Amino acid sequence: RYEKWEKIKQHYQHWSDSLSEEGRGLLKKLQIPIEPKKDDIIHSLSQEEKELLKRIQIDSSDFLSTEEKEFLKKLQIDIRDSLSEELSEKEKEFLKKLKLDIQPYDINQRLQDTGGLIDSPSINLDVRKQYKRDIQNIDALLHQSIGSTLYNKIYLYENMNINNLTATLGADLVDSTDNTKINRGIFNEFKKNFKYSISSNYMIVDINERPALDNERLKWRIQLSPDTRAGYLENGKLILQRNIGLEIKDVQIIKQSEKEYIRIDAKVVPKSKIDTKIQEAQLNINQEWNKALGLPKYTKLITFNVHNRYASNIVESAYLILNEWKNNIQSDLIKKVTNYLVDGNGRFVFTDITLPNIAEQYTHQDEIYEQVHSKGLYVPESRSILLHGPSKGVELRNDSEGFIHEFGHAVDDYAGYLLDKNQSDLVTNSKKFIDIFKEEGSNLTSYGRTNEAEFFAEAFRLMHSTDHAERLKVQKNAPKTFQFINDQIKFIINS
Numbered sequence: 064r065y066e067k068w069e070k071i072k073q074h075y076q077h078w079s080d081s082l083s084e085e086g087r088g089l090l091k092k093l094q095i096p097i098e099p100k101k102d103d104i105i106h107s108l109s110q111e112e113k114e115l116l117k118r119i120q121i122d123s124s125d126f127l128s129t130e131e132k133e134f135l136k137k138l139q140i141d142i143r144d145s146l147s148e149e150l151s152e153k154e155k156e157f158l159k160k161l162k163l164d165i166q167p168y169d170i171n172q173r174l175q176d177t178g179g180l181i182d183s184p185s186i187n188l189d190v191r192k193q194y195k196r197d198i199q200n201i202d203a204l205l206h207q208s209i210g211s212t213l214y215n216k217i218y219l220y221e222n223m224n225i226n227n228l229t230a231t232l233g234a235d236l237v238d239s240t241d242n243t244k245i246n247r248g249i250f251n252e253f254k255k256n257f258k259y260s261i262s263s264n265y266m267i268v269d270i271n272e273r274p275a276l277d278n279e280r281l282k283w284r285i286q287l288s289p290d291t292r293a294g295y296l297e298n299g300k301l302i303l304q305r306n307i308g309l310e311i312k313d314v315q316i317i318k319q320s321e322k323e324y325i326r327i328d329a330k331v332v333p334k335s336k337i338d339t340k341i342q343e344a345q346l347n348i349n350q351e352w353n354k355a356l357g358l359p360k361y362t363k364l365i366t367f368n369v370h371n372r373y374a375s376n377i378v379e380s381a382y383l384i385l386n387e388w389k390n391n392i393q394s395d396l397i398k399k400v401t402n403y404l405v406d407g408n409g410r411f412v413f414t415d416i417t418l419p420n421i422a423e424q425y426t427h428q429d430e431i432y433e434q435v436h437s438k439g440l441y442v443p444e445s446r447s448i449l450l451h452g453p454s455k456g457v458e459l460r461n462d463s464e465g466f467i468h469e470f471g472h473a474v475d476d477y478a479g480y481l482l483d484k485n486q487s488d489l490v491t492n493s494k495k496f497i498d499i500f501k502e503e504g505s506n507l508t509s510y511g512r513t514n515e516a517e518f519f520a521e522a523f524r525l526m527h528s529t530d531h532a533e534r535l536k537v538q539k540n541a542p543k544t545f546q547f548i549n550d551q552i553k554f555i556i557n558s
């Protein structure tokens with residue numbers, strides 16, 4: 064277990080000795096991201112914003128993560144008024160702005176979120192530039208390769224949560240009848256299209272395998288290439304250069320300490336090699352689907368924006384998502400709306416970076432607090448559908464159903480466009496549907512209650528569910544909405 068630390072240490076001996084105090088501080092920052100301090104955030108708030116925050120039901124919000132909710136709730140307690148022991152519209156906007164300022168400074172998370180596209184205007188300019196400087200300086204530190212003397216004499220190990228690659232499959236990976244076992248069925252789906260993988264940040268790996276901690280059932284075993292650059296962090300730990308490619312050599316179920324884990328064997332290869340495979344796939348899926356949809360042969364509609372560790376599945380699931388899409392929506396509705404999207408250079412974007420870092424969003428969303436990360440998104444200004452692979456939509460079974468919901472937004476767009484082409488608007492912004500929403504808006508899904516646009520898209524998704532039960536359910540519980548959507552569909556195919 065410890066017999067190989069010494070020769071890695073000696074290999075990087077000069078490198079470790081020549082490390083500046085600033086270099087060391089940088090590596091330390093990379094390993095331990097800087098959390099926000101409660102008192103710092105509290106003191107920065109005005110007296111009215113303090114009074115507002117302490118009245119807000121934080122757990123009610125839908126855009127705040129678990130982590131962000133807990134931190135804010137702790138602020139509420141520390142803020143002390145007279146009642147202290149010895150969501151609205153105003154409150155939503157406040158929380159959306161405050162969210163941006165309670166994020167820890169996390170270099171590896173910034174790289175993963177952006178997929179290396181660190182110029183993406185998804186964070187405040189000042190911290191965005193600081194990330195850039197740090198990342199550049201880290202790249203400069205990681206200059207010594209593992210070399211021909213050691214690349215095939217060691218394995219590098221990493222434990223990983225399944226939710227990092229796929230939170231959808233991750234919800235069922237563990238056997239529900241026995242948590243020491245892996246669900247063999249869910250295992251097969253995870254492994255099926257896992258052929259390659261990309262690291263856009265700095266992998267922190269060990270020379271000897273280490274016990275998995277909470278919620279880690281994936282145990283990576285990695286061989287580097289001679290050219291792979293790295294740094295020694297002592298204690299048998301390495302930090303690897305960013306932007307490296309990984310070919311998946313084997314995925315197997317293994318037993319350790321009477322618990323079942325998933326072994327992932329991977330070989331480091333040039334990232335350019337993997338990116339070539341992705342481009343050929345984008346070239347292929349576009350040629351295939353232009354023919355199916357009857358689009359011009361030169362149309363670029365489908366785009367792969369992938370940069371992270373489950374890369375091959377993002378590509379392959381695009382074929383599956385679109386097939387289900389074509390199978391559950393009538394062909395003539397699909398042709399009309401897709402052509403409208405294409406007419407505005409709209410895209411179907413499949414990605415494993417967070418959606419605020421997708422150009423088809425942030426180009427038309429300067430306000431960072433108005434930017435959105437989710438499983439799926441539709442942006443009318445760019446007429447694009449965005450689908451985020453790794454995440455898991457709350458109250459949403461799979462990616463295909465998410466996509467259909469997003470296509471509902473597109474249907475919403477085109478229908479409203481047909482009513483008035485130069486003064487274009489959403490059909491859900493018309494008084495007629497607003498009235499329908501005010502009456503039936505609470506009769507479908509919980510999220511459907513949010514606004515007219517989401518109610519429409521939810522009603523649309525459910526109307527095209529493979530479950531013949533759910534369709535009837537929408538007709539019964541939201542008859543006016545059901546009728547309205549069918550009316551728009553008729554309006555579209557006759558246009």
Ligand SMILES: Cc1cc(S(=O)(=O)N(Cc2ccccc2)[C@H](C)C(=O)NO)ccc1F
Binds near residue numbers: 435441458465466472
């Ligand atoms: C139910 C459902 C959700 C999403 S989603 O990606 O998860 N989503 C809504 C949301 C996000 C966060 C917290 C709660 C809800 C986004 C915002 C959505 O409406 N897409 O157009 C996409 C598609 C879909 F059908």
Ligand SMILES: [Cl-]
Binds near residue numbers: 317326
């Ligand atoms: Cl093994």
Ligand SMILES: [Zn+2]
Binds near residue numbers: 468472
């Ligand atoms: Zn939506």
